Design a protein around this ligand. Structure first.
Ligand SMILES: [K+]
Ligand SMILES: [K+]
Ligand SMILES: [K+]
Ligand SMILES: [K+]
Ligand SMILES: [K+]
Ligand SMILES: [K+]
Ligand SMILES: [K+]
Ligand SMILES: [K+]
Ligand SMILES: [K+]
Ligand SMILES: [K+]
Ligand SMILES: [K+]
Ligand SMILES: [K+]
Ligand SMILES: [K+]
Ligand SMILES: [K+]
Ligand SMILES: [K+]
Ligand SMILES: [K+]
Ligand SMILES: [K+]
Ligand SMILES: [K+]
Ligand SMILES: [K+]
Ligand SMILES: [Mg+2]
Ligand SMILES: [Mg+2]
Ligand SMILES: [Mg+2]
Ligand SMILES: [Mg+2]
Ligand SMILES: [Mg+2]
Ligand SMILES: [Mg+2]
Ligand SMILES: [Mg+2]
Ligand SMILES: [Mg+2]
Ligand SMILES: [Mg+2]
Ligand SMILES: [Mg+2]
Ligand SMILES: [Mg+2]
Ligand SMILES: [Mg+2]
Ligand SMILES: [Mg+2]
Ligand SMILES: [Mg+2]
Ligand SMILES: [Mg+2]
Ligand SMILES: [Mg+2]
Ligand SMILES: [Mg+2]
Ligand SMILES: [Mg+2]
Ligand SMILES: [Mg+2]
Ligand SMILES: [Mg+2]
Ligand SMILES: [Mg+2]
Ligand SMILES: [Mg+2]
Ligand SMILES: [Mg+2]
Ligand SMILES: [Mg+2]
Ligand SMILES: [Mg+2]
Ligand SMILES: [Mg+2]
Ligand SMILES: [Mg+2]
Ligand SMILES: [Mg+2]
Ligand SMILES: [Mg+2]
Ligand SMILES: [Mg+2]
Ligand SMILES: [Mg+2]
Ligand SMILES: [Mg+2]
Ligand SMILES: [Mg+2]
Ligand SMILES: [Mg+2]
Ligand SMILES: [Mg+2]
Ligand SMILES: [Mg+2]
Ligand SMILES: [Mg+2]
Ligand SMILES: [Mg+2]
Ligand SMILES: [Mg+2]
Ligand SMILES: [Mg+2]
Ligand SMILES: [Mg+2]
Ligand SMILES: [Mg+2]
Ligand SMILES: [Mg+2]
Ligand SMILES: [Mg+2]
Ligand SMILES: [Mg+2]
Ligand SMILES: [Mg+2]
Ligand SMILES: [Mg+2]
Ligand SMILES: [Mg+2]
Ligand SMILES: [Mg+2]
Ligand SMILES: [Mg+2]
Ligand SMILES: [Mg+2]
Ligand SMILES: [Mg+2]
Ligand SMILES: [Mg+2]
Ligand SMILES: [Mg+2]
Ligand SMILES: [Mg+2]
Ligand SMILES: [Mg+2]
Ligand SMILES: [Mg+2]
Ligand SMILES: [Mg+2]
Ligand SMILES: [Mg+2]
Ligand SMILES: [Mg+2]
Ligand SMILES: [Mg+2]
Ligand SMILES: [Mg+2]
Ligand SMILES: [Mg+2]
Ligand SMILES: [Mg+2]
Ligand SMILES: [Mg+2]
Ligand SMILES: [Mg+2]
Ligand SMILES: [Mg+2]
Ligand SMILES: [Mg+2]
Ligand SMILES: [Mg+2]
Ligand SMILES: [Mg+2]
Ligand SMILES: [Mg+2]
Ligand SMILES: [Mg+2]
Ligand SMILES: [Mg+2]
Ligand SMILES: [Mg+2]
Ligand SMILES: [Mg+2]
Ligand SMILES: [Mg+2]
Ligand SMILES: [Mg+2]
Ligand SMILES: [Mg+2]
Ligand SMILES: [Mg+2]
Ligand SMILES: [Mg+2]
Ligand SMILES: [Mg+2]
Ligand SMILES: [Mg+2]
Ligand SMILES: [Mg+2]
Ligand SMILES: [Mg+2]
Ligand SMILES: [Mg+2]
Ligand SMILES: [Mg+2]
Lengths: 150, 38, 99, 246, 113
RNA sequence: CUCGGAGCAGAACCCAACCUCCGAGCAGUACAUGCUAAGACUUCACCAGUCAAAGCGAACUACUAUACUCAAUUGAUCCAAUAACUUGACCAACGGAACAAGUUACCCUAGGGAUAACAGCGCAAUCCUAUUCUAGAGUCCAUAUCAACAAUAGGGUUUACGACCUCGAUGUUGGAUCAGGACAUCCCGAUGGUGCAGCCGCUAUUAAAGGUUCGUUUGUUCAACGAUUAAAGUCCUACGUGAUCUGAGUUCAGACCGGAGUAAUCCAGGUCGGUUUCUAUCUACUUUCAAAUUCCUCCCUGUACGAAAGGACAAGAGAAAUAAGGCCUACUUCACAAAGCGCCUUCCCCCGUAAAUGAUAUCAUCUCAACUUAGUAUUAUACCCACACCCACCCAAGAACAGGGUUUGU
RNA sequence: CUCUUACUUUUAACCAGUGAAAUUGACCUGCCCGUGAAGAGGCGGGCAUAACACAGCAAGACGAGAAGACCCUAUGGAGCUUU
RNA sequence: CUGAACUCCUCACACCCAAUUGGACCAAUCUAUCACCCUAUAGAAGAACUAAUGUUAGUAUAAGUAACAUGAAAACAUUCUC
RNA sequence: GCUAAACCUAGCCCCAAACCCACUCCACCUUACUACCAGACAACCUUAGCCAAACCAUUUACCCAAAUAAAGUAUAGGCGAUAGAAAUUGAAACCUGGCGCAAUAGAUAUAGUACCGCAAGGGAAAGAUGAAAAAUUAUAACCAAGCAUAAUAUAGCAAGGACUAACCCCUAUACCUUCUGCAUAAUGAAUUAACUAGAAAUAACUUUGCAAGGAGAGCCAAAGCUAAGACCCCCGAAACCAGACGAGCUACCUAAGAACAGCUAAAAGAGCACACCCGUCUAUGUAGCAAAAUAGUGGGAAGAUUUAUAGGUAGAGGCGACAAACCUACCGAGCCUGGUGAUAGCUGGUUGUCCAAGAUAGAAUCUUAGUUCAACUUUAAAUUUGCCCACAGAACCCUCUAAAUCCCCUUGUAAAUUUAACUGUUAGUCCAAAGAGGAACAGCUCUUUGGACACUAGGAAAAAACCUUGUAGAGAGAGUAAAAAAUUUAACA
């Protein structure tokens, strides 16, 4: 629940997209197994998909490591320093493709409750409301029931 | 429940109560009260 | 279960808040809430209550203009209702048609 | 399991109980539908269609006498002596298309079935087998492994003696002199000419019939078959020979 | 305390009445209606059972009509009534009929001798 | 307790109550009420039950002739009898166990708030109150007072009805203790009417601050009786209140008497006897700081009133009781002290009506007319009110803590 | 008993040592009226309301205790009696 | 004007009835063969516990509560009180 | 940071194979474990009952000598429940293994010991270093409840929405079981850990094999047959019967013992009154000192008295100055073990995730707290109408000449019937309407038509039954539905 978990405000990394868009995904580390049914879908992803995926994303360094493992995993690292580990155990090639593409599109900020679905640093152009905004002024700034020149 | 004929005035179902309210006699009102004319 | 059902109340409460805030802003200009919302619709201004509440806080000059526009349309309604059809439609009462 | 009661606790009454109302299966009066069912003789039907089918496929050989052993060995019929089966009954189904000439030994035969085989030049005989004899003749090899002398075939029960002593049924105990008249009668009734089987090349085979006390062709009661050594042992004692020949 | 003095009166409904309504197709033998007293009378091709049940004598369509009622001269009770009627007055009753649907048969060519 | 007809259930079918009515447990005539077989109906299942063309055999050319009249007029399986055919239960608890009654308070187990007794709740026949009507009663007179036949309301104290919470427990009468509340008021206050002279009464309006006794028999609440009182009110509060008490009654196990029963044992019967636990966790509460009610006596006065008899009100004075709050001089229990049986103090108000002036309505009219008096208190004032000597000691202060004193710390 | 009072001992309360039991869904555990499976600390409308011990009290928590012993039900038992 | 989980709007959709019934998945364990930082496909079974005044064990609450104990002085010799 | 947590062995289970079985000296059937004396007593004899038959009374499977098959056949039986052959047929058989348990498991077992009972009998708990303890200042840490480090600040099922912010604001009547309906002041639950509850035939269905045949003799077969997969819980009575064990308590009896001051009377089932026995009344106590006591007050106290010792009567019984007393703290008939996992139509309990369909006319019944059949409901399969309905049509007798129904093409719709296989539901509530009973009372009772509820949300104040509204997610959009209570009074000639 919201009260049982942390929250944050909607934000970006270094004002991304303002002057130019910079992909936040910086590194991908695959750990596949030469033998093992759990990694069957991950092995097929490395044969036809990983090479074409790297061509599109030249700013992401992909590290494929083939070693004995019972649970194949992809570890995504982002420019802001976030590290995310996602198991690809027994996933199909299409499933892995979808997951890897999602990681490429994310900023790396915590996937937690966002308080507001918007953010702005300049919420007011005409002046933020205050109690005197719509109050008229009086001659000599006299207060209610105030004797002047006594 | 109570029988269709009772010694007291039986409470009506609310929908019937509304029906009665909406179908009350409305007398014809003259534009000018007749006592205000010759 | 509470967290699940609270999603309904969040939307309900959010809208009660906007109406309260819009009512406050309208009263500062001598307008009641129903007059503003009703008459803005008659001007084909489809601004929702969320935006209207935000405008009241952060765009008070625009909101006074919206209040003025609603007030103008409201007065045109009265003149039309008072008239017997002789009068042409009010300048702000004309509706843009879409075919 | 539901809620409470006997359904959930597992204690509902026996099957057939109706809550105390006199149950259906009891309130119906008793009647002897099945009285003596276990003492009723049964006969596996063998149709002329099935017999013709077996002959066409080479499963039964019409060049030699056909009895229960040959029918069972060809998997033409399945006999269950423990289920009160007394043999095969030859049924008329397929008579119109039956063309084979056969010498067949059965336990029962319909009049029309007899005519179908005799019109084609064949011979049909009705032969009784008691429950022990029927078991032996159907599965000879299991019997030979018991090391018992071949038993004599018992005579029919008194109620069946009229059937098997009548030439109309081609009884094996009927007077051979009465067969010519019976064979001619069927030929007249069903509009065919009785063939003279005495002129046939297979006449000797057509006449081959086992003695009424003989279970197998060529084997006499009281012979011990030695399958391991492929020999036959014959008793020579006078008393034993009298028992097995009577 | 006290007890009720009315006993009996627990007979179940007889399930009597019309089984085949107007326009329904009936085969011969089908019961058209069951009744305790004569409410519907047997018309054309409609038999009446010992218990007054009406049944179809022919295959066809059931029809209900109103017809003039002339009793048998031997039916003393009915004849006693009609004789006491004012002249010009005719009794009517409801009758049910079966309109036969099929012909009794057809002549077919069987040989060319 | 099974079966049929009618109403409920008005018109296809169907349809319940310890609902309203009437019936059945046969009889008569046949002796083809012989055989056989399409298609259907069906008592909400099954079982059972019902109707039938054609055909065979009869009858037949007079018989509303062919499955008899009649509404129900009835009983499964097993089994028994019988050569066969066929027959056999008020098996009426009528879908029928082949054949078995009482009693338990000496009782037991499993359950039920699906179901009673106590209480609550529902309802208001019954019960209580008010008003409407104006017969009658009241010497006349309907309305001082009482009140028939009826009518319209309210109350929720009785006896009942219902069975909605509780039977892995909501302890059952009366009393003791302490009482909270309603006013439909028993006494005290203020008023209108009277068949109110006065004294006593009757009746209605207003008033719930205060008060509302002790005894004999009875377990009694009641009731009767004795003696009083200004009066000995009516009700609600789980018929207030047993984690405060009592246990005479009711209502276990023992026993006697009358009665019932063959007995066991039992009866709204009477009678003698019979174990009433709880160490308080939570809520609530533990100095509403403080205005008082009533009777009697004298006096007014033997006055007002009255034929007489009889016999007040208001003010004035005194003395008591009760209640609340204190105190120890004496008395008494007692003795550095606590106590009552002793003594001391105790203060405002009640709104129902009765009268002027005066409009609507040019009189009049106390006025949900404007208004004026009887006629009103911000209920009054009273009490309480300072504070780092405080280790220790003392104390009229106190469970602890706190509080007062130590200028009484060898 | 009217009508209670005083004193002693015990208990009591405080200090020191030792140290149980029934009970306990969770509890951040107010009052009034109303409501509701028909008698509310928990619902609706109001009012009240810093926090925390110790000592009392027994109106409530339909307080604890004993799967009601009264009553009814079960084709559940047992004792006793008998035409 | 306000006012639903009704309806519309952006995206998605198997994703709100007791008893009962149909279906799709699955934790851990063992076995076969794989796998080799904890797995796969199958075959098996003592195969899943917020509740039975459940059984056993631990520790709470009531509670530091109820309750319990040692006559006096002294040189610890002795004496005194009862 | 404490308390604790964690471990892998001890052994055990089920099979196979194999027949089995003691011994130092001394003691041991008397009061066993007691060196040493006159006796002579001697073993066998049908199980019953629970239970099933929904009661119960005849009856109700229990290795009895070869697996299989014949066969659940012949046959038996309140011919009910159920019981049940034989002739005949006829195979294999190499102990040293394990899809068994691993300290709440597996034997109860570290042991039939401790402890409990007079006895028969019942019957536990638990251990954990390392190669070395002749390395003991050695093996780090991290994990239940309970606590400590570190008490507390208005307000409330303790959370959710949130928020700059713990709280303050707004929304929200624990769970389970049981019911017509439970926040209920109905049931269970202090909490943690471990343990603790669905076993299978008949058919059918699905997927292979082969196919007029199938199957590794039996059996079935008018597309069948063979094989496989997939459906049937736990705890609890009072009881009944059999065989043992008990009279050291108590009831009564037998043998042989003991006690009873003083005073009066002197004769005593006499009086007063100690020891002693009993237990009338009150208070205290009520998890107590005590599973029947204490304090006082009482009855008897030379007798039908009280009392020590040994012995006898035993549960279909004993014993009883009958209280249905007492027979080892619980006797309307003891206790122990066994039959026994007795039985329970009765209460309680019944363990991972997700989706889907799903609410109910009646009949019979020693039956109305239950069942079986219908009805409804669910899955699969087949092929063809189902629902809505136009005219025409369906009774006289009789007082309500009722709202309606039945039948039904068209049309709008997509269901319906049949086949196959089953379960659960058969203890019902309010509202509107037509009636019956009661009192034209009941939140009353009984039928009928419809609705709602037992399922969601909004409204009527809180609110099962009234109104609005249904098909499921996200949204910091929008239009709506139902939805607020009105009223104020008497002059008169
Ligand atoms: K038969
Ligand atoms: K009966
Ligand atoms: K009533
Ligand atoms: K109760
Ligand atoms: K008395
Ligand atoms: K509390
Ligand atoms: K006036
Ligand atoms: K005193
Ligand atoms: K209390
Ligand atoms: K053990
Ligand atoms: K429960
Ligand atoms: K309640
Ligand atoms: K309840
Ligand atoms: K209870
Ligand atoms: K003895
Ligand atoms: K004691
Ligand atoms: K229960
Ligand atoms: K039952
Ligand atoms: K509404
Ligand atoms: Mg009605
Ligand atoms: Mg249950
Ligand atoms: Mg039930
Ligand atoms: Mg009737
Ligand atoms: Mg009926
Ligand atoms: Mg039927
Ligand atoms: Mg005929
Ligand atoms: Mg019956
Ligand atoms: Mg019947
Ligand atoms: Mg009987
Ligand atoms: Mg008695
Ligand atoms: Mg009981
Ligand atoms: Mg009830
Ligand atoms: Mg009552
Ligand atoms: Mg109550
Ligand atoms: Mg009333
Ligand atoms: Mg008069
Ligand atoms: Mg009352
Ligand atoms: Mg009822
Ligand atoms: Mg309880
Ligand atoms: Mg009082
Ligand atoms: Mg009054
Ligand atoms: Mg009371
Ligand atoms: Mg008490
Ligand atoms: Mg009490
Ligand atoms: Mg008493
Ligand atoms: Mg007597
Ligand atoms: Mg008494
Ligand atoms: Mg005076
Ligand atoms: Mg005047
Ligand atoms: Mg005037
Ligand atoms: Mg104390
Ligand atoms: Mg202490
Ligand atoms: Mg409890
Ligand atoms: Mg209340
Ligand atoms: Mg306290
Ligand atoms: Mg106390
Ligand atoms: Mg509570
Ligand atoms: Mg209690
Ligand atoms: Mg009980
Ligand atoms: Mg029994
Ligand atoms: Mg909205
Ligand atoms: Mg929707
Ligand atoms: Mg959807
Ligand atoms: Mg997995
Ligand atoms: Mg697996
Ligand atoms: Mg398990
Ligand atoms: Mg657990
Ligand atoms: Mg448990
Ligand atoms: Mg305490
Ligand atoms: Mg103490
Ligand atoms: Mg002491
Ligand atoms: Mg039985
Ligand atoms: Mg019985
Ligand atoms: Mg044999
Ligand atoms: Mg063990
Ligand atoms: Mg912990
Ligand atoms: Mg709140
Ligand atoms: Mg559960
Ligand atoms: Mg109930
Ligand atoms: Mg509720
Ligand atoms: Mg509860
Ligand atoms: Mg209960
Ligand atoms: Mg199974
Ligand atoms: Mg018995
Ligand atoms: Mg016995
Ligand atoms: Mg003795
Ligand atoms: Mg003696
Ligand atoms: Mg003496
Ligand atoms: Mg004496
Ligand atoms: Mg004496
Ligand atoms: Mg006595
Ligand atoms: Mg003694
Ligand atoms: Mg004695
Ligand atoms: Mg006696
Ligand atoms: Mg007695
Ligand atoms: Mg005992
Ligand atoms: Mg036993
Ligand atoms: Mg059981
Ligand atoms: Mg669904
Ligand atoms: Mg019967
Ligand atoms: Mg029933
Ligand atoms: Mg229809
Ligand atoms: Mg149609
Ligand atoms: Mg039913
Ligand atoms: Mg009702």
């Amino acid at each position: 629940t919201a009260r049982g978990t942390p929250s944050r405000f909607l934000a970006s990394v270094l004002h991304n997209g303002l002057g130019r868009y910079v992909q936040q995904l910086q590194r991908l580390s695959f750990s596949v197994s030469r033998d093992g049914a759990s990694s069957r879908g991950a092995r097929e992803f490395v044969e036809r998909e990983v090479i074409d995926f790297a061509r599109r994303n030249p700013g992401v360094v992909i590290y494929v490591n083939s070693r004995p493992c019972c649970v194949p995993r992809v570890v995504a690292e982002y420019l802001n320093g976030a590290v995310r580990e996602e198991s690809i155990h027994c996933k199909s090639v299409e499933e892995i493709s979808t997951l890897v593409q999602k990681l490429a599109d994310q900023s790396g900020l915590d996937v937690i409750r966002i308080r507001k679905p918007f953010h702005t640093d300049n919420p007011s152009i005409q002046g933020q409301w205050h109690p005197f905004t719509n109050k008229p002024t009086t001659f000599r700034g006299l207060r209610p029931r105030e004797v002047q020149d006594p | 429940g109570s029988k269709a004929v009772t010694r007291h005035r039986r409470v009506m179902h609310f929908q019937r109560q509304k029906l009665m309210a909406v179908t009350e006699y409305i007398p014809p009102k003259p534009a000018i009260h007749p006592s205000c004319l010759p | 279960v509470k967290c699940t059902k609270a999603r309904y109340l969040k939307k309900k409460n959010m809208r009660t808040l906007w109406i309260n805030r819009i009512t406050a802003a309208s009263q500062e200009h001598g307008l009641k809430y129903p007059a503003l919302i009703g008459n803005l619709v008659k001007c084909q201004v489809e601004l929702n209550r969320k935006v209207l509440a935000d405008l009241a806080i952060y765009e008070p000059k625009t909101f006074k203009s919206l209040a003025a526009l609603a007030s103008r349309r409201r007065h045109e309604g009265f003149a039309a209702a008072l008239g017997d059809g002789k009068e042409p439609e009010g300048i702000f009462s004309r509706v843009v048609q879409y075919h | 399991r539901g809620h409470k009661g006997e359904r959930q606790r597992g204690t509902r009454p026996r099957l057939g109980f109706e809550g105390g109302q006199t149950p259906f299966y009891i309130r119906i009066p008793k009647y002897g539908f099945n009285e003596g069912h276990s003492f009723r003789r049964q006969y596996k039907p063998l149709s002329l269609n099935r017999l013709q089918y077996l002959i066409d496929l080479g499963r039964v050989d019409p060049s030699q006498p056909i009895d229960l052993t040959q029918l069972v060995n060809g998997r033409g019929v399945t006999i269950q002596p423990l289920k009160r089966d007394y043999g095969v009954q030859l049924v008329e189904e397929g008579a119109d298309t039956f063309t084979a000439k056969v010498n067949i030994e059965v336990q029962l035969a319909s009049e029309l079935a007899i005519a179908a085989i005799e019109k084609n030049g064949g011979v049909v005989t009705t032969a009784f087998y008691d429950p022990r004899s029927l078991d032996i003749v159907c599965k000879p090899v299991p019997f030979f492994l018991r090391g018992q002398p071949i038993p004599k075939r018992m005579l029919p029960p008194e109620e069946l003696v009229p059937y098997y002593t009548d030439a109309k049924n081609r009884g094996y105990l009927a007077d051979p002199a009465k067969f010519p008249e019976a064979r001619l009668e069927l030929a007249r009734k069903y509009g065919y000419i009785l063939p003279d089987i005495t002129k046939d090349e297979l006449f000797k085979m057509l006449c081959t019939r086992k003695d009424p006390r003989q279970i197998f062709f060529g084997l006499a009661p009281g012979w011990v078959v030695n399958m391991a050594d492929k020999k036959i042992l014959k008793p020579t004692d006078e008393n034993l020979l009298k028992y097995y020949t009577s | 305390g006290g007890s009720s003095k009315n006993l009996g009166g627990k007979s179940s409904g007889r399930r009597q009445g019309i089984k085949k309504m107007e326009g329904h197709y009936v085969h011969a033998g089908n019961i058209i209606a069951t009744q305790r007293h004569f409410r519907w009378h047997p018309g054309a091709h409609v038999g009446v059972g010992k218990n007054k049940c009406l049944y179809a004598l022919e295959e066809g369509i059931v029809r209900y009509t109103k017809e003039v009622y002339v009793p048998h001269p031997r039916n003393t009770e009915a004849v006693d009534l009609i004789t006491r009627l004012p002249k010009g007055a005719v009794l009517y009753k409801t009758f049910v009929h079966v309109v036969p649907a099929k012909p009794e048969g057809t002549f077919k060519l069987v040989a060319m001798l």
